[PDB]
């Protein structure tokens, strides 16, 4: 699709068999989701933004469908304000900015 | 133009009498610029990021050119590590997400 920006670009995602809403965020290097269980091993990591840093769990090579497009990549899990899809996955689904 | 998301989507903006690099940020409701001593009346505001809130100065009706496209709107100034173009201005320049 083509998505305009008068509202937050929230989309439905599927991950670990579960549906969630997430924010398409071209200002995020990485993908960060709200606290949840994901299968497999994770590594503790920290990520920063406005307001400073938070602790997250890094899961690698995690499948996620964003709209109906398939991605498999790094998903961080922690106390993000909102589910965020970052560039690492936006690139995988072929997402660009256009003006 | 079309901007790919392999790297941070940074572009040149012109605000007041300055050119700056700024991040085209679909994950930002508002536009937030690194500290600079802009003239004009302002109102205090607090904006939230992944790590918590920060204090900023809200300037209204500020002309700003983004990659040659003229816009005018609310610009927030404060201790952000990166200049951030938010949805408030991305809409004015006809910016979409596409995949």
């Amino acid at each position: 699709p083509q998505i305009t920006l008068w509202k937050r670009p929230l989309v439905t995602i599927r991950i670990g068999g579960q549906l969630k809403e997430a924010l398409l965020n071209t200002g995020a290097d990485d993908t960060v989701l709200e606290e949840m269980n994901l299968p497999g091993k994770w590594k503790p990591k920290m990520i920063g933004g406005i307001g400073g840093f938070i602790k997250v769990r890094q899961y690698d090579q995690i499948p996620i469908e964003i709209c109906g497009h398939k991605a498999i990549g790094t998903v961080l899990v922690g106390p993000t304000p909102v589910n965020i899809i970052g560039r690492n996955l936006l690139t995988q689904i072929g997402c660009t900015l256009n003006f | 133009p079309q901007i790919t998301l392999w790297k941070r989507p940074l572009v040149t903006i012109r605000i007041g009498g300055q050119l700056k690099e700024a991040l085209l940020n679909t994950g930002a409701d508002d536009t937030v610029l690194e500290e600079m001593n802009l003239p004009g009346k302002w109102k205090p505001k607090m904006i939230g990021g992944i790590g918590g809130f920060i204090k900023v100065r809200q300037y209204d009706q500020i002309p700003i050119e983004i990659c040659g496209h003229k816009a005018i709107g609310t610009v927030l100034v404060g201790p952000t590590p990166v200049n951030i173009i938010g949805r408030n201005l991305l809409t004015q320049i006809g910016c979409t997400l596409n995949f």
Binding site: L23, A28, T80 | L23, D29, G48, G49, V82, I84, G86
Partner: peptide, 9 residues
């Protein structure tokens, strides 16, 4: 790495 979410409230 960095995640520049901005909540305008």
């Amino acid at each position: 790495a960095e995640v520049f979410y901005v909540d305008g409230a």
